[PDB]
Each structure stands twice: as C-alpha cells, then as structure tokens.
C-alpha cells in the first residue's frame, strides 16, 4: 500500500502510559485517564461526587484544595 499511515495509540493524559484493552478509560472533558489517574493529586483518591478543582495543571478534591490553595 502506498499511503502514509498514522500509528498513534490512546494514552493517559496524566501518566502517558498506554491502556489495556480490558480497562475502562475515564473521559473528562475530552481527556483520557486511567481510573487510578483520575484522582486527587494530593490524596490520590477518586473525587467524591466527581468534584475536583484545577490548580496549576493538577486536580484536587474539595478537602485538599481548601486545605492548600483556596
């Protein structure tokens, strides 16, 4: 075949690692994440009620955002 080919694979926004075909990819505003990567940067837990705050390119739960940056 005489056509140029692209080869890009989906990777995690946060960690740049690939996805296994079996795992659920979290989509948050167009961005793909490992489940364990769509978590608070401070406590590493999934966001209660899905609520997070962005600060300087990192995501934080309400508790940690209030404690550190609010």
């Amino acid at each position: 075949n005489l056509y140029f080919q692209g080869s890009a694979n989906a990777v995690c926004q946060r960690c740049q690692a690939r996805f296994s075909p079996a795992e659920r990819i979290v989509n948050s505003n167009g961005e793909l994440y490992h489940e364990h990567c769509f978590v608070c940067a401070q406590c590493f837990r999934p966001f209660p009620e899905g609520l997070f705050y962005e600060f300087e390119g990192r995501k934080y739960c309400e508790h940690d955002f209030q404690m550190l940056f609010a």
């Binding site: 960690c15 740049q16 690692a17 940067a41 401070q42 406590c43 590493f44 837990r45 940690d64 404690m67 550190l68 940056f69």
Partner: protein
C-alpha cells in the same frame, strides 16, 4: 497615616527573587519559619517552585527543614512532587526527614512515584526512603509508581537492606 507597601517574602520566594529575599533575611527579626495563610513557609514556596538559589539561602540562615504546611507537607514533599531533583538532594543533604508524613500519611516518595519523577524517587530510596510504608488509605509509595519504577525502587531498597513487607498505617 500613610501606608508603606512592602514586598512580601512568599511572593519573592515563589518568584525566586534572590536580592529581595536577601534583604528580607537581613531583617534578623523576621521569622524564617512563619507560614502564609495556608502554612507555606518561605522554604516551602522556594522548594515547590524550583528556586534553587533561594532554597539554599534559606537553609544557610537556619530555616527549619521539616516545617509543615496546613496539609502537613514538608518542603521535601513539594520538591519531590514537582521533580526538582537538585532541591531534593540539597534537602536530603541538610538532613530533611525523608519519611515525613503529611495529613494523608503520604511521604515524599509517594509523590515522586505518583508523578514518575524516577531519579528523584531513586535519590530518596538511596537515602533511606521506605518503599513499603502505607499512607492512611493503605497505599505504599511504590503502589503509586508505574511497574518499571516500582521494580527499580524495590531492587534498590532490597540491596540497601530494607524490609519490603507492607506496613499498614497505625496511630
């Protein structure tokens, strides 16, 4: 009754403006360790924003290395989290508490691992950072690493004589 505006130390440390920081240090009655509204000290901010010269200036005047902010993070947590390797090494050399725990039971190694700061993580383990210490939610530092980093760090810790057994959080 006229206000006299001043440069505040926290901004100067964030920005790494060394002369302004030095002028502040020259006021010997300034408290080197006093934190801002969120408990971030001058040293916290200098370490977080990678301002190597200012970090050293503060350390050399005797700033407390293991100061804690409102989340109980130390300067070392922040330097490791944000991958400032030179500053991590400086902190370790001036006897930073390598296994200092924040409000979540996280050590600096948790953040080095989580953020794939591979060489920072290596520097930490090389200086006695425990690889198997659970945070308050049962996660060890190497639980936050990708598998290749996990294995690299476990190997280093093994060679150093660490006990690799998972340590659940107590107290």
């Amino acid at each position: 009754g006229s206000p006299e505006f001043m440069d505040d130390i926290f901004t100067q440390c964030r920005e790494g403006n060394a002369v302004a920081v030095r002028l502040w240090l020259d006021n010997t009655e300034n408290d080197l360790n006093q934190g801002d509204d969120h408990g971030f000290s001058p040293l916290h901010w200098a370490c977080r924003e990678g301002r190597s010269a200012v970090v050293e200036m503060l350390i050399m005047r005797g700033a407390r290395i293991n100061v804690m902010n409102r989340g109980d993070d130390t300067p070392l947590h922040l330097a490791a989290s944000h991958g400032h390797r030179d500053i991590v090494q400086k902190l370790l050399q001036y006897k930073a508490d390598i296994n200092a725990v924040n409000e979540h039971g996280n050590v600096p190694l948790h953040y080095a691992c989580f953020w794939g700061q591979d060489q920072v993580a290596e520097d930490l383990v090389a200086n006695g950072a425990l690889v198997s210490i659970c945070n308050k939610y049962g996660e060890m530092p190497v639980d936050k690493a990708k598998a290749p980093l996990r294995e690299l760090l476990r190997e280093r810790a093994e060679k150093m004589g660490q006990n690799l057994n998972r340590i659940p959080y107590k107290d």
